[PDB]
Structures are given as structure tokens and as C-alpha cells.
Design an enzyme around this catalytic site. Structure first.
Site, short mmCIF file in Angstrom:
data_model
loop_
_atom_site.label_atom_id
_atom_site.label_comp_id
_atom_site.label_asym_id
_atom_site.label_seq_id
_atom_site.Cartn_x
_atom_site.Cartn_y
_atom_site.Cartn_z
N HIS B 162 0.93 -1.19 0.03
CA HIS B 162 -0.06 0.23 -0.09
C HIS B 162 0.86 1.40 0.00
O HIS B 162 0.36 2.27 -0.02
CB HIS B 162 -0.80 -0.05 1.19
CG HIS B 162 -1.82 -1.01 1.31
ND1 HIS B 162 -2.80 -1.31 0.16
CD2 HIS B 162 -2.36 -1.96 2.18
CE1 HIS B 162 -3.59 -2.48 0.49
NE2 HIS B 162 -3.45 -2.84 1.72
N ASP B 198 -3.02 -10.37 -2.45
CA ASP B 198 -3.65 -10.00 -1.47
C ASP B 198 -5.23 -9.78 -1.67
O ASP B 198 -5.26 -9.05 -2.70
CB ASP B 198 -2.90 -8.93 -0.73
CG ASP B 198 -3.14 -8.45 0.62
OD1 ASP B 198 -4.07 -7.35 0.71
OD2 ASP B 198 -2.27 -8.71 1.62
N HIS B 200 -6.45 -6.97 -0.56
CA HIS B 200 -6.57 -5.48 -1.11
C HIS B 200 -5.65 -5.16 -1.96
O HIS B 200 -4.86 -6.00 -2.55
CB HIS B 200 -6.04 -4.91 0.07
CG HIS B 200 -6.58 -5.03 1.57
ND1 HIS B 200 -6.20 -6.15 2.48
CD2 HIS B 200 -7.83 -4.35 2.26
CE1 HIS B 200 -6.99 -5.95 3.39
NE2 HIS B 200 -7.88 -5.14 3.39
N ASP B 287 -5.22 -12.69 3.32
CA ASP B 287 -6.45 -12.11 3.91
C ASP B 287 -7.63 -12.46 2.99
O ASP B 287 -8.78 -11.65 3.29
CB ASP B 287 -6.18 -10.78 4.49
CG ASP B 287 -5.45 -10.03 3.29
OD1 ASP B 287 -5.11 -10.55 2.22
OD2 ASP B 287 -5.24 -8.72 3.54
K LIG Z 1 -4.64 -7.74 -4.27
ZN LIG Z 2 -4.69 -7.21 2.65
#
Ligand SMILES: [K+]
Ligand SMILES: [Zn+2]
Ligand SMILES: [K+]
Ligand SMILES: [K+]
Ligand SMILES: [K+]
Ligand SMILES: [Mg+2]
Ligand SMILES: [Mg+2]
Ligand SMILES: [Mg+2]
Ligand SMILES: [Zn+2]
Lengths: 348, 346
Positions: B162, B198, B200, B287
Site C-alpha cells: 500500500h 492479497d 486488498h 487475507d
Molecule cells: K490484491
Molecule cells: Zn490485504
């Protein structure tokens, strides 16, 4: 009312905004912008018999939406209900925002919208925030109406304050920009030119942003150096307007420990700028967080200096609406704010 | 059956923050040291392969991705925060709102907001040391692969995907996957793919390479209309300039299981095949798991074996960088299942 008197508009609905938490220094603390601020000023208005005290009229969302976007107004009305319905257990506080390099795109998620519409995390939203912000805007609009219908001046005892709010951004304890709403109401009623003078310790970034490309509304702010204090990312002296608004915004910056003897030199520069602009009405965004005992600010005005400030503002000779902004030493906030009004009315 | 080396730094435990802003409250942080310790324990239990400490590469390779001003900020932020009299952990209160200037201020609070995208990633003592160690873990894994290993597991903590060139958030400070990808490029690998599985969106990785065609960035993730990072990750973000068609976001709604998610995985693998990279970096989060406390996909522990197998079939030099995954009692099984599936376990 007799010479030496000024009317005050006050709404008991300000007490509907009574949040319990404020993010500060990495901790959740008791908020600075507390209901006793308005109650202490009101008690001093009554005690000094400044003038008539009246409740606001309801003007509806029309005049608010002359300044704020419809999507933002809708968001403020639903935010708390959506927050609770999404399972959050604290007050509504942004966790994420549009960082540098991300898209200014409105998301569906309530956390996403909280961050999209905010500039800081110290302004918790809870039940009653919508109702108090609406009433505070109506307080400012009622004061503007009093002046438009004949009063030389009126005191809009707004809470929550307004000058940090942009057309579609809340923060700095502000939701609707009461000063900007009053200024635009003057313009909508045929006042050709309006000046907004921000003497609160902090930069009126919201007011600057709302009128930045306009030459019909002059915006001036005296404030602590944004390199050192909120709002950090606006308020610098090189921000003079854009497009048609170029040369119609003026920021005057001061360092820590600045006393009235120095600050009033900046006030004199602001008053000369107002004189050459020659407006038909004046809105003063009044904060007394310039006070030497203010817990979050670094100027050194004394309570007696507020009498002098009010005297100087009266010498501008303009129809004048005062909107209450900041000021956080509650022991002295009433003396300080009412001293401005009394000095305007000839006291001392 | 096959072996894979793991790089791990005990310096990750230098980052052990006590507070995370969540739903208006200060809660126990999700991104906790037992995540890395549980994975490491399972790596040892399964005898996945040799476990190595990272080498110190210095800040050169980090500054190939991150700005010098940002790297300086991360080193001094905690000290400046304490010297300014703050009593909590370092958390931004204000930021560059829409309509404000992207101008760097003197004040520590102001710089905290300038350099962040969220308030859930507290900074405290040892954050700098752990973030430096995590980048070195990724760089050591990349070195192992450049020097002959088919693949290596960078057991990074804190995670990385991120973080932008000059923005931290989402528990990330240095973009370990981007740093490893740029290291491949700097060593003569002409094309590199970064695949983010992931839950996210890898918004930082997307932003770092967004105008570039030499690094293909692909992410599968939950719909950003509904989850972090909210303001990037949409399917219409396909790149900028010469980077047009070299970014691919694949979005899924709540409750998505592997039988659907793996269809997106197949689309990503087909894009990688036509790109034909010289190296692959996998930003690996677990996750996506059905019990993850902050995410909404429904992968099972056995699905991570299938994921690992599919990634091996790409036939590329591969660096895995550890990202998210917050159901701690399953995180070891889940993460190591990806590596074991890569090596041939089914
Ligand atoms: K991702
Ligand atoms: Zn994540
Ligand atoms: K001001
Ligand atoms: K203006
Ligand atoms: K790219
Ligand atoms: Mg949410
Ligand atoms: Mg500060
Ligand atoms: Mg579990
Ligand atoms: Zn103020």
C-alpha cells in the site's frame, strides 16, 4: 436598539452537538470545541446587556447550498445513521482519505466517504451534529438578515464554527461555512461587493477556497504560520487568488509569541485592503483563540486588546456581521468575545 | 516435496505498536508480530527449506522506489513526535484535503499527514528499524533468485504493497514488492511482473509503476467501492501514458470463493503469459481467507495449495513478498500452503 447596543443571535440547538472524543496527539481526548463555549459567551452577552438576544429563523438548505455542494450537504445529513448502521462503535471519525496520488472519486463505503469529505480526524460526528450545524448556519443567516434590514451590526453566536469548511470538506471543528454563507447571502440580496475578514488565530482556509476565483468577495485572514499550525496546507502569504480572483485574497501570517502591538500592524494592513476594496458589507469571522491563555494557539492578545479590536473594526464604517469561530479558554471566552462587541459599540 | 528458502528478520519485532484507530476507537492492532512468528514456526515445522537472515543492502535500492524526503521523514518521525510533546503513538490528525496544496510543512503533525493515506498505521519506536529490515528481507530474497533459486519467500513484516513512493499507510511503509521488482530491473531483467493476490488492492505498487510498461502490475482484490483503499483499484485504471495497458485490476464482491476468484487468477496469468516477463514478484496476502477479520472473500486453507501450484505453472523466477493476513491461528498453514503448493504439494 439604543446607541451602544448590538443584537445577538443564538440557538439552543448548538447543544445537540456534544461529542465525547477528539483525536489529539495519538489519543482520544475530551474535545476542545465544547458546548460550554457558547453558553459562557451567551451568559456574558446577557450579563453585560449587550443588546437583544434572539433565536434564529429557519432559512432551509437553499442558502447553505449557495456555498456547499448538494452531495456534501446530503452526506452530512446521513453520515451518522450510516455509520451506526455499518456497525461502528465509536463516534464517526475518518480512518482513510484521498492520499496524494489517489483518485478524487466518491466511494460507496461510509468510511470512504467520511475521508473523501474531510481534511482531518479531530472533528468527530455523532447524533445531533447535523441539527447543530443547520442551526449554526441559520444563526449566521439571521444575523445577516438583521443587518440587511437595518442594524449596523449583529453577533452570530455560531456553534459549531465554520471558517475551515470548504464547499465540500469538513474539518477543524467546522461543517458549514457560516461566514461564507452570510457573505453569499449579502451578494444574493444585491450587495455588490462583500469582504470577509478572518481574525481567528487559524487561517480561514474554507472561506479562502470558496471565493478563491472571485473578485466580488474579498477574503482576508490573519493567522498563525501554517508551516507551524493547522491548517498547514493553505494560508501562506503567496496565495493571492486565481483567475478573476487574483489579488482578492490576502493572508497575513505571524509567528509564535506575537502580541497585539505586532498583530495590530497586520490588522491595519487588512483594514487598508478593505478600504481599497470598498465593499458594501463586511463579515468578520471572529475567533478569540488569539488569546494569551488559549490552550491550542500561540498569540498573546490580552482581554483588553479585544476592546481595541472591536473599536478598530467599527472605524471601517461598514454593515458588519460577526460569526463566532474559535476560542478555547472557556474561563475567558465570554469576556473576550463580548469585549469585541462592546469595543465596536464604543466601550473603553 | 521441493524446497524453497525463506528470508526472515527477527527485527520485525521492533515494530510492536499498541493502538490502531478503527471505527472511531483505539483498538489492538491487526498487523501484529505473532503473524510473522506463526508463519515462521510453520516454515520450520514443515521443513520448507533453509531459513536465512537478510543482508544489509542500505538505502540505495529503497531509494530506487521511494523519495529521499520520504525516507528521511520515516527515520526522524518518532523522535520529532516525542520531542514535540505528543503522548500517544504517532498518528496523523490532519492531511491534504481536497482543495488544499500539496506543500510540505515544517510541523511534524503536518508532515505526518502529508506523507500518509490513513490514520490506522501508528508509528512508534522501532518502526524505522523494522521497515528497513523488511525491505532487506525482500532484497535478500531477490538476490537468492537472481543467483539461481527458482523462488524465494520474503517473510516481510511490516507489509509493503500500500506504500507509494512517498506515502505510507495500510500498515505499509516501504513497498517491498516494488523494491524487489525494481532490483530485478536494475540487474538487467528487461521485464518484470508484479502479481498482487492479497485481498486488498496494491495501490502503492500500481502508483509506483503506473506510467511504465517495463513493469506489469496486476492485482486481484475486493471492490474498492466497499473496502480499503477506496480511491484506487478500480477496473478502469489501466495505466497512464506509456503505461497504458500495463496495469490490470480485477475486482470481486463480498463472499467470493476460490471457484470464482481463480477465474480472475486465470485472467491475470494469461496477461502475464502474453507480457512474457523475465521475473515475477508475488505480493502474497492470505487475507483472502474465509475467516479473515477485515476482509470478505471465502478462500479455504486448501485453496492456497492450488494457488501455489498455479503460480508455479507460470514457469518464472519468483519472489514472494508477505503482505496481509490477519486470522493468526490459520496464517501459518495458509501462507506456507502457497509455498508448498508451489513446490508440488497437493
Ligand atoms: K490484491
Ligand atoms: Zn490485504
Ligand atoms: K484568521
Ligand atoms: K476572493
Ligand atoms: K505499469
Ligand atoms: Mg468500510
Ligand atoms: Mg503541530
Ligand atoms: Mg481462525
Ligand atoms: Zn481558530
Amino acid at each position: 436598539g439604543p446607541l451602544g447596543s448590538m443584537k445577538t443571535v443564538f440557538s439552543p440547538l448548538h447543544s445537540r452537538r456534544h461529542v465525547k472524543t477528539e483525536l489529539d496527539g495519538g489519543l482520544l481526548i475530551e474535545p476542545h470545541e465544547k458546548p460550554s463555549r457558547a453558553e459562557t459567551i451567551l451568559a456574558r452577552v446577557k450579563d453585560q446587556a449587550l443588546g437583544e438576544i434572539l433565536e434564529p429563523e429557519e432559512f432551509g438548505l437553499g442558502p447553505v447550498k449557495r456555498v456547499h455542494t448538494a452531495d456534501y450537504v446530503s452526506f452530512l445529513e446521513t453520515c451518522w445513521d450510516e455509520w451506526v448502521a455499518a456497525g461502528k462503535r465509536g463516534e464517526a471519525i475518518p480512518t482513510f482519505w484521498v492520499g496524494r496520488g489517489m483518485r478524487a472519486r466518491l466511494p460507496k463505503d461510509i468510511d470512504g466517504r467520511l475521508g473523501y469529505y474531510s481534511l482531518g480526524a479531530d472533528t468527530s460526528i455523532s447524533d445531533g451534529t447535523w441539527e447543530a450545524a443547520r442551526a449554526s448556519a441559520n444563526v449566521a443567516l439571521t444575523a445577516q438578515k438583521l443587518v440587511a434590514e437595518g442594524e449596523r451590526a449583529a453577533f452570530a453566536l455560531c456553534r459549531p464554527p465554520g471558517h475551515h469548511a470548504h464547499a465540500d470538506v469538513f474539518g477543524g471543528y467546522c461543517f458549514f461555512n457560516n461566514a461564507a454563507i452570510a457573505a453569499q447571502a449579502f451578494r444574493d440580496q444585491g450587495y455588490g461587493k462583500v469582504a470577509v475578514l478572518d481574525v481567528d488565530f487559524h487561517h480561514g482556509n474554507g472561506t479562502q477556497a470558496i471565493f478563491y476565483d472571485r473578485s466580488d468577495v474579498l477574503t482576508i485572514s490573519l493567522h498563525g504560520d501554517p508551516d507551524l499550525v493547522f491548517p498547514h496546507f493553505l494560508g501562506f502569504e503567496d496565495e493571492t487568488g486565481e483567475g478573476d480572483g487574483e489579488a482578492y485574497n490576502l493572508n497575513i501570517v505571524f509567528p509564535p509569541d506575537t502580541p497585539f502591538s505586532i498583530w495590530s500592524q497586520g490588522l491595519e494592513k487588512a483594514c487598508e485592503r478593505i478600504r481599497t476594496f470598498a465593499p458594501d458589507a463586511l463579515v468578520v469571522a471572529l475567533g478569540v483563540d488569539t488569546f494569551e491563555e488559549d490552550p491550542i494557539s500561540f498569540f498573546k492578545l490580552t482581554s483588553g486588546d479585544y476592546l481595541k479590536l472591536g473599536k478598530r473594526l467599527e472605524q471601517l464604517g461598514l454593515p458588519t456581521v460577526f460569526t463566532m469561530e474559535g476560542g478555547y479558554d472557556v474561563d475567558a471566552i465570554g469576556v473576550n468575545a463580548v469585549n469585541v462587541m462592546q469595543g465596536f459599540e464604543g466601550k473603553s
